[PDB]
Design a binder for these strands. Structure first.
Ligand SMILES: [Zn+2]
Length: 91
DNA sequence: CCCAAGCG
DNA sequence: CGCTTGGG
């Protein structure tokens, strides 16, 4: 059961591991906590995705369309409008 | 110049 | 953890 987060980007310095394009400050982003090959030195760090790019990879990231949004830690803290958009985007 | 939030 | 850099 890989663990997931959802939040508004704290900054514009993070990069979407999907499209490899930088995410903008304030933009809704999703993460799988997960060791990096490069820095196993680091333990379980966040890998961030555009919700779209995330969705592209539900399988490879081990997303459980069953449980749904509830499984994204922090999902409840989002604007109602934003909460909605995701529910839709979701398997 | 400065330095800790942010990220990786 | 250590580095880069937003935000002073
Ligand atoms: Zn992306």
């Amino acid at each position: 059961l890989g663990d997931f987060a959802a939040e508004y980007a704290k900054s514009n310095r993070s990069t979407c591991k999907g499209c490899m394009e930088k995410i903008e400050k304030g933009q809704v982003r999703l993460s799988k906590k997960m060791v990096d090959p490069e820095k196993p030195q680091l333990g379980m760090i966040d890998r961030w995705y555009h919700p779209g790019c995330f969705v592209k990879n539900r399988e490879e990231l081990g997303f459980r369309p069953e449980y749904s949004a509830s499984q994204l830690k922090g999902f409840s803290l989002l604007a109602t409008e934003d909460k909605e958009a995701l529910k839709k985007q979701l398997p």
